[PDB]
Design a protein around this ligand. Structure first.
Ligand SMILES: CCCCCCCCCC[n+]1ccn(CC(O)(P(=O)([O-])O)P(=O)(O)O)c1
Ligand SMILES: CCCCCCCCCC[n+]1ccn(CC(O)(P(=O)([O-])O)P(=O)(O)O)c1
Lengths: 341, 341, 341, 341
């Protein structure tokens, strides 16, 4: 009882974004997700701490899920902020964990290990090909989609048919992750050491050095590359609509819908906007408020995604090289929407 | 002599279009240009012949230019009509070739090779992206722009400054080649096997299978795609003007300008035209007759381009898709033309 | 018996490098390769003589091969010492040449003429763009690759399959030529007039004057450029591996492999080395002695290239400016190798 | 036909041993066996790969046989070189499969799944007892014996009674596998991590640390263990004879007899041979050619197996600590051979 109280607080203190969205879910269901996020957010803390030697991570991370069956475990001064607190007093998480139906214990435990090894694979190398790019997103987000999806089926709140093919689920995750990777470009490169996720298979066509876009002189090629990334992201939209339209439970829907609409809105702002190369673009608090409101039932949300896909395509001219590819990606997306409208 | 006289006889037989504009040329330039054409024409035959195995082409095409240095070489059973004769009696071409100035020879030999190798590149891969489309047009037409431009400087008829930047020279070719690719859609997609040049990046918004455009049922989409192709072509117009505006010699100008005015005329007739998918759209012999008549100096050729670009723009409503796309490209062309009137 | 015997005598004294490797081929094929070299070396003698006006070379070279069928042709007052003897008594060369199979002759003559006009092209212009750098290397090296390959097929020692795509054969030559061009920087620049083969497109990013690299003051940037040159060279390794992997005959293999491993070993020494800007970096005699011994079969030569490539990568830190560009180029190389291990 | 081509090409690059023996087979049957191998070879890749997490294999391998009907499935980061190229381009394999006979398909899918699950079992534990040894060989070899046998009956080539008892079919597979495990002892133990297959129940009687065999100090006790392994494989011989005798179709027999005579030949060499603890014992490439030539019909192959089984015993004395055990296991095989003469 006392433990769950720590989780929801440490949560609300770790991700103000997620914390609000999760409130759309039902209590029992919500709890599982809450712990699930914390389990991953804990793993993400060890991976991110750059003051920790690599071989260490490659050694611990893999078997981080094993500490889920040990209510005595915890980690010392690893990470900073509230994150460092989650590890030092991780005990509370493992507690609430053992009080979850064995059904949820498996999903969380499995997804954890899988994501654990995934991160380790990329601690050795960087993102080169489109394949790499997609694999990374799968490891840090795709699997989350897989996880959440399984929990929906495990709770009976969602038809068992939903777990049959977890492809669209992966798309749900990849979309959000890619949207961020694109949006947080500048920040990623301003850190020391500089983090780069944009696959060379793409940015190389527009430059020899990715730090060149940091300059206002290479803007032309920069923005162009930006649209190249945006396009790559739109490929998932059609599948996002499919996954959303296949949800029956209104509680689960809103929880899965909002994050997607937020991304589309953000993706429409970053698309063909040089501002992405020096500042962090964000959607007005009013827009995100509107999004939260109407994203309660399939129809309203679909017409919202409709607007943002048209708002995105409206931000381009007839003299942009990506003109044709973008329009096609937009049409397909809309197609999928009308398909369910 | 007897060889050179054959070149002209075969030229007038194979090409009833080019052979007419080449007479605007002069006697060494015309001979060189005549030989240069026959060389590329012989190359195109072997490459476009589908009965010929691919591996062969990839082994013989890259060295096709070497034959220019061997007056005994020829080809027996290849191509239809006069084309077969051109290869069977290629001796004459090489015979005459050897009597040209090393300057002219180097241009022809060099360009022939570069083109041959470029062709070999697209023999084992489809034209997927817009970039692919531009590269192809560069290999088979853009390079002809370079060649001729180099022949001008070589002959001393044009200022050496011209060959400094061959970018616009490439635009001259791409404009012609694309216009033909757009105009000869039906003829190409009907051959066996069907020849496609329209880049997927563009036609995939309107259709899954390109053959669908032959069916009147998909006329609506066919026309939209068609207009997307035209917009893609209008991009080169401004540069076409710049190149023609940079020519000083009368002969060279007319020879370079006529084909361009012819293209802009054909383009203004195929644009938003639904007949391009079931017949070959041509200009009246009167329209072209006039073109050959007035395209002898900048000023006249300019107000003709202006006229045709206007006719082209006056063939669309505010209601339909590419309105904005086109009107923008039309203004750029005109604006570029006025900048010289 | 006197003519062919003269060929080797001159060969051994003009090329102390090639003259060694060539002894790996069987007599018949070896004699052909011997003439092929002497012809190219003679062609190289004219182009290299700087005490001879340009318009002279531009007239003679293009029609050099024609002298192959003339048992009395020769040239005097060209080349230093021995090289001069070659041209002075070029009679023997053509005599022994007039006894080589019609197959070989057509190859030597073919490549000769192609290379000749290629040199003439770069006698009036400089190596400005990367395309120029690649084309130049193709004219002086790439062609040697094509040529040698054709001789292998002609001799019947290699399957005719080998000459179906000389793209990698070109990569072979470029890798050697590029390596030497990089290693022999100081040597070439100190000559009067200063010889520069490093493309502006690459070094213009690090300096205004290329002579600045001779001064210890600009040492830093000089090294960065050196690494970019090496990076530009590593692009061919994966292809070099493919070519050697497609060889079946022992003699042909060693003869083709040895020079390659030598280049790689040399490249691993010059990479990120400042000494390159003031002396000739050589590999130990024992190092080459080893290469000659083990480079007799694929697998053996592969692990060497493997060791040398890793040593090259081990000669740097993540701090280095090109680290990433190289890191991925290194993996790309090792991958092709493992692909055959 | 475009996919089946990819198969044979990849097979020759992977199995240079099997690749030849499979050509013996007849057209129709030939294709089936080709796929069947590439299916098990693809599966074998995921297993052999050590860098892959253990939980990945257990979640994937068991469901591998299902990807056969999914004509667009493939894998990327798996296996080194050519084997990696198979999983990545596994498309052709799944297509060439979808075209095979319904009967042929069911069998390949069956053996695959079964074998896959057996591998997952031995992926989480070592080989301790002889039973473990035999069961392991059953999964990676004995099952193939069943597979092929079920393919001979399916094709109709062989009697339908040939599939009632697959015991001998298992012995066929084990004999080959055990002959390799014993022969490749060194090559396996010299990898990181060290691969050990010899059952503890057999080597413990001669050593405490199996690695000791790599040192000449324990050579004497290494040879005894080796001879214990041979006596362990001779058991299957009498059974291998019955199976080969049950065959009737020429093509099927040759394809089944060659590998067996090869194993026995290899066994006669590695028996009581101490060179097994530092190198790879191969059969003279001349002897293997003989085996290939004469193993086309039962009679010839019986006298060869005869010779090799006598060559095995013609290497020991009555003093050896195994004499008795071997001597009789030989006569047990020798008689079983003459029982068909
Ligand atoms: C700076 C000048 C740019 C040079 C670009 C010229 C190359 C354009 C391709 C020439 N072309 C393509 C098709 N045609 C028409 C013909 O194929 P052609 O035999 O060339 O007259 P046909 O008369 O319809 O048989 C002409
Ligand atoms: N290819 C490029 C360089 N080399 C080496 C020589 O130029 P080569 O005589 O052609 O072996 P050198 O013997 O070092 O003068 C060969």
């Amino acid at each position: 009882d006392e433990d769950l109280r720590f989780c929801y607080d440490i949560l609300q203190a770790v991700s103000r974004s997620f914390a609000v969205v999760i409130m759309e879910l039902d209590e029992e269901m919500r709890d599982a997700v809450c712990i699930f996020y914390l389990v991953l957010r804990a793993l993400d803390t060890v991976e991110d701490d750059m003051s920790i030697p690599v071989e260490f991570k490659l050694r611990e991370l893999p078997k981080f899920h094993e500490h889920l069956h040990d209510t005595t475990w915890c980690m010392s001064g690893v990470g900073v902020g509230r994150e460092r607190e989650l590890l030092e007093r991780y005990t509370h998480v493992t507690r609430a964990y053992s009080r979850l139906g064995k059904a949820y214990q498996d999903v969380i435990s499995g997804i954890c290990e899988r994501m654990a090894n995934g991160m380790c694979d990329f601690l050795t190398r960087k993102v080169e090909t489109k394949a790499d790019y997609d694999l990374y997103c799968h490891y840090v987000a795709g699997l989350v989609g897989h996880g959440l999806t399984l929990l929906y089926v495990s709770s009976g709140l969602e038809d068992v048919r939903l777990a049959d093919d977890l492809t669209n689920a992966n798309h749900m995750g990849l979309f959000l992750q890619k949207t961020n990777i694109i949006r947080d470009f500048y920040e990623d490169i301003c850190e020391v050491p500089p983090r780069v996720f944009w696959p060379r298979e793409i940015w190389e066509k527009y430059t020899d050095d990715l730090h060149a876009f940091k300059d206002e002189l290479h803007e032309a090629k920069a923005v162009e590359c930006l649209n190249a990334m945006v396009a790559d992201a739109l490929v998932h939209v059609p599948h996002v609509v499919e996954y959303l339209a296949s949800l029956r439970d209104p509680s689960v829907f809103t929880f899965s819908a909002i994050p997607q609409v937020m991304a589309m809105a953000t993706l429409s702002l970053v698309f063909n906007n040089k501002d992405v190369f020096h500042t962090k673009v964000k959607t007005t608090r009013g827009a995100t408020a509107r999004i939260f409101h109407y994203s309660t039932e399939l129809q309203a949300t679909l017409q919202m995604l409709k607007t943002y896909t048209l708002r995105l395509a409206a931000r381009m001219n007839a003299q942009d090289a990506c003109y044709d590819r973008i329009e096609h990606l937009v049409n397909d997306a809309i197609r999928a929407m009308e398909s369910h409208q």
